[PDB]
UniProtKB/Swiss-Prot annotation, chains A, B:
Residues annotated for Mn(2+) binding in this entry: 221, 245, 249
Record bears the keyword Protein biosynthesis: no
Name of this protein: Tartrate dehydrogenase/decarboxylase
Biological classification of the source: Bacteria, Pseudomonadati, Pseudomonadota, Gammaproteobacteria, Pseudomonadales
Cofactor entry: Mg(2+); Mn(2+); K(+)
Length: 359, 359
């Protein structure tokens, strides 16, 4: 049996998570999987307002008893600053459980109104491999001469050979397994004079060990432009913490909505539990009207089963059936308003769950 | 009589600059303007291979004798590293001439095949105000334990109250003058725990002085998504060095092509000459076939005349005539392949010059 730590967090995380669990429980029944869910109320801004911290001091001790983390979203800027909420919860999960690979697939499904003109199904099908433990996302630095005309703010970005090499290796290994065998590296080696030339140097060094893999590097500005103008060129896109963050909102947007995009925060060595969550945040401006798209949450669940399954064919079939159910519901138009439909969050969850059971 | 330092630089900069000068000379004749062009062969990789530096040591002394700099593009990664070429030339112009405001308009013109579905003229019309002197673009830091497994790379981002306030003031001043009176601030105050919450704090402080201006802040990832999904929402977009760079390729891409996007590197106080250039780079992949879109270069020239004119109204009329001519040529389909046309670089430049004269 697999033990799952379910952590809804803030906002629409509370709306979409139960729909993810619903579909997972339907998948478990169908394929005879043994799954056990425990729900935690912390890693939320409500917990912060009561305790002065996002999580209890022994959070890591508690979560290490679980096989994986199923996570909604964190953040409520009306009550708690965004840097406090994220760094006090999700970023601690990512860094302390060494979940260095952030896998975020981008796909245009049949029946989706595409944001891009003259694009067909097949034109948008790639994976963002995002470095998840270092880089531009930092709490290093500080402020000098605060509250004066001479005020200076410094922010450090750290890249290591260990961290850079391991994300590049994962991306090239992934490309090798895929049909197109192609890696695009996100860079900015003109403007960032130290970090990015180094990233390029390590990319070149890694690409040499993969004779079968075609590779190119693109400055982040023109890469974003190409997501819009020629998304067909991409298969595996490898990027730093910040660049990967940007590309994994932009990609899904080109495919029509951010509401379907899942993410796997993987510790591939399996020394710590991995974390599965939507790309999207807590969406405070739609929380409460139950119109949040639950597909991102559900797809994240499918990725979780695929990762936990390893050698077990039951878990792979459960993943495949969940994707099948998602595809069918989208084709039917049984979707939320962000995809042009009229169904509520709960109705979409129910539709996917029912479709899955009827497969 | 205004003295213009023409610096084509590398690649397609050599192709598009003459087309810019050609249109400027036609505008000069039509409106009785006094323009003198001097071409400089440095700030190029050819110069670097000969002398070991991008520019002569006395470049600043030479250029301070001119009223404005008309710049093509710099970069040739086959022979000179991108960080060396950019930092040794353009970035010195921007920082030593304190050209802290980088103005980058984004517009969907009639007759352009839009990259976005179900979008029409009036849905994409905004301006990116990019901080041009500090922020994430940095050569501060370095490498520790090089060529070992312990290898670390550090890069520092610097923001100052002086620098942050002046760019925000410019953006809010600009919004106040415009019809929609709206500022969107590009941020990432969850991941970047020091620099971006500070940027937000200063934006809040500045916004308080503008009761007529509505303002919102958006995390950079979802902001990029909204450029694709709802570009009609934007009027003035203010951003750091890095975020402004990304958004000023993404915006024009949504509008159909990067080949039309101009940029004005302004020192508003006029202590130093300002620089006018296309957003696009040297495009080594198309250099030689004369298919490069010269409109970005030409539009940049119109912006130059607008800025230089000050009180002289025939310089404003020249800008207006040049934009008029650009619009008519685009509507006629007399355009380069990037806009779906079959004309060469020289034919487009000729078409704009001829149209201008006939107005
Ligand atoms: N992994 C995480 O826990 C992340 C947390 N956040 C946090 O979330 C809060 C809001 O940040 P935003 O920049 O607004 O990002 P967001 O992803 O929460 O929302 C951006 C926009 O997309 C829409 N949206 C998001 N998910 C949707 C869904 N499932 N269905 C339909 N529409 C959806 C929202 O309505 C909003 O207009 C902040 O506190 C931020 O720090 C943001 C991104 C990731
Ligand atoms: N301000 C400047 O002088 C800048 C210089 N660069 C430099 O330029 C070099 C190439 O960089 P890239 O990332 O390829 O950016 P790029 O802007 O030069 O080209 C990107 C893509 O857009 C196309 N493109 C660019 N301008 C075009 C035009 N006017 N008409 C039709 N197509 C056009 C190119 O063919 C290429 O596929 C690098 O060395 C880089 O450092 C890049 C950006 C700005
Ligand atoms: O913080 C974010 O926006 C993320 O992880 O996608
Ligand atoms: O360097 C760049 O890419 C720019 O300034 O647009
Ligand atoms: Mg994100
Ligand atoms: Mg750029
Ligand atoms: N999330
Ligand atoms: N340029």
């Amino acid at each position: 049996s697999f033990r799952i730590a379910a952590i809804p967090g803030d906002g629409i995380g509370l709306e979409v998570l139960p729909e993810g669990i619903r579909v997972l429980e339907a998948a478990a029944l169908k394929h005879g999987l043994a799954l056990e869910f425990d729900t935690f109320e912390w890693a939320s801004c409500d917990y912060y307002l009561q305790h002065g911290k996002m999580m209890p001091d022994d959070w890591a001790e508690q979560l290490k008893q679980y096989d994986a983390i199923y996570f909604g979203a964190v953040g409520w800027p009306d009550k708690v600053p965004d840097h406090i909420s994220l760094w006090g919860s999700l970023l601690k999960f990512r860094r302390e459980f060494d979940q260095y690979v952030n896998i975020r697939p981008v796909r245009l499904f049949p029946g989706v109104p595409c944001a891009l003109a003259n694009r067909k199904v097949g034109d948008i099908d790639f994976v963002v491999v995002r470095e998840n433990t270092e880089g531009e996302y930092s709490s290093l630095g500080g402020i000098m001469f605060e509250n004066t005309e001479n005020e200076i703010v410094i922010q450090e970005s750290i890249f290591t050979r260990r961290g850079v090499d391991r994300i590049l290796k994962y991306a090239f290994d992934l490309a090798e397994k895929r049909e197109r065998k192609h890696v695009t590296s996100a860079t900015k080696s003109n403007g960032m004079a130290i970090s990015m030339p180094y990233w390029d140097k390590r990319t070149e060094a890694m690409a040499a060990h993969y004779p079968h893999v075609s590779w190119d590097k693109q400055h982040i500005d023109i890469l974003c432009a190409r997501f819009v103008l020629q998304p067909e060129r991409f298969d595996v896109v490898v990027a730093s913490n910040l660049f990967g963050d940007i590309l994994s909102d932009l990609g899904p947007a080109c495919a029509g909505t951010i509401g379907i995009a899942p993410s796997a925060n993987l510790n591939p060595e399996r020394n710590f539990p991995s974390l599965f969550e939507p790309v999207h945040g807590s969406a405070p401006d739609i929380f409460g009207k139950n119109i949040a798209n639950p597909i991102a949450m559900i797809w994240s669940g499918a990725l979780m089963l695929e990762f936990l399954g390893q050698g077990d064919e039951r878990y792979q079939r459960a993943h495949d059936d969940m994707l099948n159910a998602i595809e069918r519901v989208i084709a039917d138009g049984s979707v939320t308003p962000d995809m042009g439909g009229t169904l509520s969050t709960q109705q979409v969850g129910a539709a996917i769950s029912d479709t899955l059971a009827r497969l």
